[PDB]
């Protein structure tokens, strides 16, 4: 109810595909879900074995807390959508527009690590040109959730369709898993790469062929 | 019946594709095995010249066995096949992922030395999507065997048609061969890279070409 | 009592020097202390508002009780620690062993997030030389704790003067914190370097430098 | 006795020093000790459970015994000692000539896996210039034996100070072990680099600082 | 007569092709040709005013005569072809297998000086697959004559499919001639690059690019 | 007799330093040379086995005879040398004028193979700043002739000490040797660098490191 | 009539198609004048000809233009060519690469630095490699337009090898647009001429131009 | 009379120091003149002029000369030069690296193309950044000799700036050396003129000269 059209918009849309994350409505406040946070964290590092009266560890687990609700899985929270810019498209491109080398950060839902990525996005505008940098601004907004990273690239994409008033968008997402360099196989050196393509990057073997020979010299 | 349903619904497909790594089977416990090519690597030293009495040879022998055994053909044994983790597609993906620059390390048959690698494998998910790292011990298991990079590349592609229940599957491995590298000829820049791909990575040149593209 | 010599040695050496990780003595064991965890992150994950009921996720607190305990911080057991194999300097070596980057994982003790980053060890040889493989255990096993980069690298230095009977070490960490890189200021691009030195790589400038100009 | 002079100088500067490897008196001819380890290696594939019936195993025995006695181990027999040629130094280098990127193979003597490296050689002329192939084969020959990095650069730098006539050599290599990077920590990209210094290149800093900074540059 | 059967196999397929080196038969064994070649380099050195009697002059001509016949010059006999080992395809594949950044050096037979080059091959097995280590062994045979590299490609390629019982073979060469480089026009930079493709690799499209785009990646 | 001064000044200079290639006076013409040439090459080629009914091959001998007189030895004639012109050090220069990455071609004098290689030249101007190119042209002169490498630096070095009219200068060579990598040993990876300096290149340690540093 | 047979049918093939470069005095008197009018400029630019430096620069500069740099304007100093039969039956592209490439502007005689790349299908002969670097330089050593460089260098080959099969591109830096005017630090033009099957066979026109840039 | 202050400093310190490049015409004028001397000289290559591409060179070069790479000979097209007060208080040197430089050979005429890298200390002031890749440029379009423009480059800065500690480095390739004569494809060459405590303090030269290796 205190949600933007476009987060509304957007929210919806994900439901109605199946591709929203795991949620449930909160009964406590954010204020509140930091505390109880940072209680249990408290154990955590107790069950640890971990002395918390030392400077450096005894705000560790409020500095967690606080990392979660605020900042990592800020993008659980629709009040945190960007808000969108649209002009019109009075230039009438009509071939793709192309933003790669985004900075992504996220985290994997299965061991809550780190994955750290780039995305590559491209659309063609049909009414609207989105500002640019709101592009950067959604791919952050999802991947600030616990993830999969296949979910992930299909959430980013039906939100740029939504928005866009468009389906010819494609997502390309290209990232480190430290679920699997930093522990179990620890895996130095592999990276996955996952691409979620609508309309005509999908069915047009010229539009699809030229955003994935494109992606494929950078990652 | 000791092994897991996975790794044992692999073998068997392995098996019925004349695929599966040459084997007998076992008649002795790993550790007296152990012990056994213990013995026999001490008398190889031994007809070598080299003296055992050094603190540091002394113990090449249990070091040896040690590592055929339980590391680098750890693979030979299924009972070592991962544990494997599958989730819903309920994301509904039908495009291609892609794992690249899988860390391989193996020994070639012929002359027992290492072969390392990169592997790089996509597929694309049916009903299932596999959990990541588990594409990286697939790989790894096949690997850690007296191999074929040629065979290799085909154990891991049909071991995953089997568990992600889907033909959809492509497999490359590049490689460099210590036994061409380190002896013989002894080239010293040359790579080998092998491909096997499977279901629409075969036969639909779009799909196909989007792979091997990736690759390069 | 149930810890190696020299785990002993090297905890006793760290215990003196006021450098052990902040530690109180353990009255769980490691099994309970993890269904425990998982308790709590269970509850952690309610408080996020996140639905247990999806299959993805269902098991998530659990894999993270056992990442704690068992991986990532596996190093605050010292029953964990490498089993070290030292062979005489017979050869008499006396210019320095240098190991570079060595994979180094770790856990930022203020955040809990990932730290990656590349350790390079050096030391002289006085009476002993250490299996190689052991310098890379060594780094991990520190590493494997909730750290501050600063006190990771001193506890490394002194935990390789203590096993190499010789205060000539140096070690020398560059890392990307994902607490700078992942939340907050998020800099993307930069990285940090601690550098411990010590006897000649502190005093003597031709060493100190000779390591130095090694690692850039 | 069926030894070079070059040979023999060596392996005796060596046994002085008590820098020789780890060696003992054949009283088998070689055709009859690759046959020997031939048997044993079959064996050992058995204990490994392999099926020597397969084509492609068959062979592996004899291949692997053919490799140890007369490939990578051929160093062990100063008969496979290079022939050593030197030109009078008439043109009088009194500089330090450097032959770097030297490709090295060798064998770790724990685990008799691969060693892959390459070793940067330096010296300073007295008397004679020494045909630059023959530092690479001296490099090669020591390297052909079951190795510890550190004997392996010691050895090389007093082989050629022996044949040189001079203290004045240098020796620097830096190799991935596979005995680290492929079993136990499985560290896919560290390495080691190791020293030998003779003559200047230990004690005049001047000479040690150029030779030293010169190898920084490529490892 | 004296040679092996896969020699001769290869041989005989050149000569049907016409793609043999031009070649005589001996009437002199290699010890007397050497010895006649050393007398004629001797003269030859004289003719460019050269002081024979310099002791890093002296050996020359010899060293030059035992380099031709026995080393760069070495495949122009077919005693010197590689040992040939096969194994059933039993593992089945169907998709090329690839060789690439093979280490080839050669002599420009116009001018006798060196040619330095890679090449990648790469075969689709039918029934056998070739020991990956005779693939390098191959193209060093070819490349260890006075060539013309569109020959030496040429020859490589049908050696190999004979050998293999298989058309599907194609092989990519790229080198720098010195004869370019080192003397006439001087050019630093050039490089030359020949492609022979065989069965499918020239015939079918896909294959074909599979196989070139991949080479492209060479340099 | 028919050199030019410059020409006659190295000739001298090299002669008494004891650094000349070894030479002797020539008894026939360069034609008459070249023609006897084309006969020895033509019979070589005959006892490679080779058939010179071949159109490819039929000129082979007339071309390498071509070659070593006239292009690759070419650095033996004196009156090959280049013409040297210097301007006035009026704008009073006084640190070193470094020429580097010098292209550099010449022949194993012990296998008569091909030497691939970069110079780098540097020196003080005292009275004569010379023409950049006349560096580059000194290089190639000494280049054109069988070499060693380590006698070809010391007479690019001395040769420019002479004309520069000052000690204060430093050459640098950096080089693949064919006899090495096409033959023999076959070291597809090494390269041989050698260095020769005078005056306050040799002695004076921040001019010395300055050189040296530079060149890397 | 003093011309090799080869470097005529060259010069005829470029003037018939419209694509040659647009003779009363011998070379060495041509350059006594062109080195006056250079003593001039230097005049009008201020430059004191006095100094040791300079003094010779006039000269220098005529030498340049007759002998090195627009020596690609006499057809005396056409490369020889040296072709051999196609015995061994190529009939893939053979490519040379890289090959050095310096030129000047047509239009403010300043200097062009490239590099270009050939190939061609041998249909009779084979010709020797280093012809193909040296027919590049002849025709890059004068005053050009890269456009008209680059479909010359086509032509000659394709008379030299008696193919259509011939595919030339250069990838060059003009200092006109670098060192002058706008002064474009970064930019670089390349030109393409595809002959042949190169032209109509996407395949081998495919194959060039994908190997041209990587 | 007609020049800056700064400009007339700079002008009688070269003068002074022996280090100036070696004026009865206006600049129109010369253009003319050199404009009609250019056009003998295309006569003089046998080219025909009569071509549209042609046709309009020799104006083309008359202006590149006085006006664009020749510029520099003209202290009216000296830089304007603004300085703050080093309030501040900064005392080690700021460098300015990878200064795109292009110039002539004052030899053959002929394109130089390289980069400097300048430092100094500031004493009393700190001039404005863009100012001292302005003072490159204006001392590289003149026809030089590398050595002679690295020193005036590093008199004119030390005037301006009124301290002794600035360095100045040059490397660059000289088309007189890669598209002429020897053709050497891959040299450069490097000069420096070092002032102050670049000179004489060890740290300072060496903090100076390994940073511009690196
Ligand atoms: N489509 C397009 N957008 C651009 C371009 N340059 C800037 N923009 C975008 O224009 C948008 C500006 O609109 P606003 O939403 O009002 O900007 P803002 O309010 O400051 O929001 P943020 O930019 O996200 O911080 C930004 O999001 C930019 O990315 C461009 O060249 N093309
Ligand atoms: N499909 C997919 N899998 C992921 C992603 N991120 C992490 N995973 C994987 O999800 C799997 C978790 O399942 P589990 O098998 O229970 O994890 P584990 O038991 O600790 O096993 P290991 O990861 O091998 O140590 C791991 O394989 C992760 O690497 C992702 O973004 N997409
Ligand atoms: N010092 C020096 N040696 C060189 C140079 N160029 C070639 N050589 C060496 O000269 C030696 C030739 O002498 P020999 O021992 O008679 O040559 P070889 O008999 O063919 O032996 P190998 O070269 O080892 O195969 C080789 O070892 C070359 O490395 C050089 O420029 N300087
Ligand atoms: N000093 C030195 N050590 C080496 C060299 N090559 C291998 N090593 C090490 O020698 C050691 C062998 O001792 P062990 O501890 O018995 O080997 P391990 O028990 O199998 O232990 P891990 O290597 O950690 O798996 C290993 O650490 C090797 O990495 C070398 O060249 N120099
Ligand atoms: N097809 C295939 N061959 C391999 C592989 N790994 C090693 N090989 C080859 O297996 C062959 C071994 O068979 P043999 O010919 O009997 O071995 P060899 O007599 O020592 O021959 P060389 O290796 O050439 O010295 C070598 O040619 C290797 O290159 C592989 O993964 N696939
Ligand atoms: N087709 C082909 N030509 C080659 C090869 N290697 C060298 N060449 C060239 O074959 C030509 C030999 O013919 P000639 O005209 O007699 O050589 P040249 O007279 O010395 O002329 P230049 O090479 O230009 O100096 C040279 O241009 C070589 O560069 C090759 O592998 N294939
Ligand atoms: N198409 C083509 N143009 C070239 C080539 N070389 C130089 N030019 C251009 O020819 C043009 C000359 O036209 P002008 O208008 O007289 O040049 P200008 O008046 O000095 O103006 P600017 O060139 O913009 O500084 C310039 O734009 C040059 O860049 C070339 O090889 N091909
Ligand atoms: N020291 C110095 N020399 C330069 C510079 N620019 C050009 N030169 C050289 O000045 C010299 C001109 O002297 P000349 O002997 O008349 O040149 P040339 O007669 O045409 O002979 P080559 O230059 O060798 O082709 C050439 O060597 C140029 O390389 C420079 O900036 N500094
Ligand atoms: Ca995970
Ligand atoms: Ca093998
Ligand atoms: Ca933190
Ligand atoms: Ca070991
Ligand atoms: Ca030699």
Do not use: W
């Amino acid at each position: 109810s205190s949600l933007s059209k476009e987060a509304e918009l957007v929210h919806q849309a994900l439901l109605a595909r199946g591709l929203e994350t795991p949620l449930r409505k909160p009964e406590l406040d954010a204020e509140t879900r930091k505390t109880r946070i940072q209680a249990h964290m408290t154990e955590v590092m107790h069950l640890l074995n971990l002395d918390l009266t030392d400077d450096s560890l005894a705000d560790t687990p409020r500095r967690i807390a606080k990392m979660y609700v605020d900042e990592i899985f800020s993008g659980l929270d629709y009040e945190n959508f960007p808000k969108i810019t649209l002009i019109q498209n009075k230039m009438k491109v009509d071939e793709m527009v192309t933003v790669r080398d985004i900075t992504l950060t996220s985290t994997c839902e299965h061991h809550f690590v780190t994955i750290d990525g780039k995305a590559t996005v491209a659309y063609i505008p049909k009414d609207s040109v989105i500002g640019l940098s709101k592009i950067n601004r959604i791919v952050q907004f999802f991947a600030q959730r616990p993830q999969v990273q296949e979910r992930l690239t299909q959430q980013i994409l039906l939100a740029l369709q939504t928005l866009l008033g468009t389906n010819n968008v494609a997502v390309s997402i290209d990232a480190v898993h430290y679920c699997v360099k930093a522990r179990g196989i620890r895996d130095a050196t592999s990276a996955t790469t996952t691409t979620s393509l609508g309309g005509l990057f999908k069915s047009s073997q010229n539009t699809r062929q030229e955003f994935l020979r494109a992606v494929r010299h950078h990652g």
